[PDB]
């Protein structure tokens, strides 16, 4: 179970973000309702190899099922469309949006995304 | 191997649209082929209008190992609602939300439509 610190606000974000000054950062954008959101906690976070490329890796997550105010509002920030949407900053705060991924991705992909940033 | 290198805009994935004939509203959505529309997230409000009760059209099912089954639509869905009354400015309020297959959710989201005044009889 990897250990996700949540956020809910765009502040909480760049909080969070300055706080990682120096560690590559995950966000991961995460819906109840969502069944693709489900599979990825259910099958790819869990995976072993998945956690430990994470190892180094700053865990944020901003769980938006009540799809409220806030909500609407970070996701309109982060210019996310839907879910599940993981965004990937680099250890100097430098987000890399064509790297971010959208829908679901088995645990053989992820990992192998995930270890591209050597 | 490049760490920088699928899924459309809401709006390109369910292309919605209306067209109303005196007390004749159409309801209309273009959906995506791969993409669905949930059955039980449609909602129809009618503000300064009155409206005769929306009768939802039987559609498909899709299973997932997690809510079991839900009833959804593909291709197109075709909603006809009927206008009995409605005040200059009255407006339809249409709330619906879709996924994609490949495992995508989108958010809800809700269209305005505008209706033209329509009197008693």
């Known amino acids: 179970h990897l250990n996700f610190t949540q956020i809910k ?10 706080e990682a000054k120096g560690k590559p950062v995950m966000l991961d954008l995460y819906a109840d309702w969502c069944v693709a959101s ?12 998945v956690q430990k490329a994470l190892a180094d890796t700053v865990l944020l997550q901003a769980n938006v099922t009540a799809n409220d105010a806030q ?29 971010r991924v959208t829908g679901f991705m088995d645990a053989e992909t992820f990992s192998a995304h995930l270890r591209d940033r050597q | 191997g490049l760490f920088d290198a699928q899924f459309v805009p809401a709006d390109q994935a369910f292309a919605f649209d209306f067209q109303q004939n005196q ?4 309801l209309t959505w273009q959906i995506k082929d791969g993409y669905y529309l949930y059955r039980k997230q449609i909602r129809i409000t009618p503000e300064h209008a009155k409206i005769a009760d929306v009768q939802l059209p039987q559609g498909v099912w899709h299973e997932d190992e997690f809510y079991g089954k839900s009833e959804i639509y593909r291709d197109r869905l075709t909603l006809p609602v009927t206008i009995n009354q409605a005040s200059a400015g009255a407006t339809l309020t249409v709330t619906y939300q879709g996924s994609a297959d490949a495992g995508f959710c989108y958010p809800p989201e809700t269209k305005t439509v505008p209706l033209s005044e329509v009197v008693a009889n």
């Open chain 1, 9 to 18: 606000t765009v502040d909480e974000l760049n909080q969070a973000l300055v």
């Open chain 2, 23 to 26: 007390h004749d509203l159409n």
């Open chain 1, 38 to 49: 489900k599979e990825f906690e259910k099958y790819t976070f869990s995976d072993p190899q």
């Open chain 1, 71 to 99: 909500d609407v509002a970070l996701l309109k920030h982060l210019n996310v469309l839907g879910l599940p949407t993981i965004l990937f900053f680099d250890g100097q705060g430098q987000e890399h949006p064509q790297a």
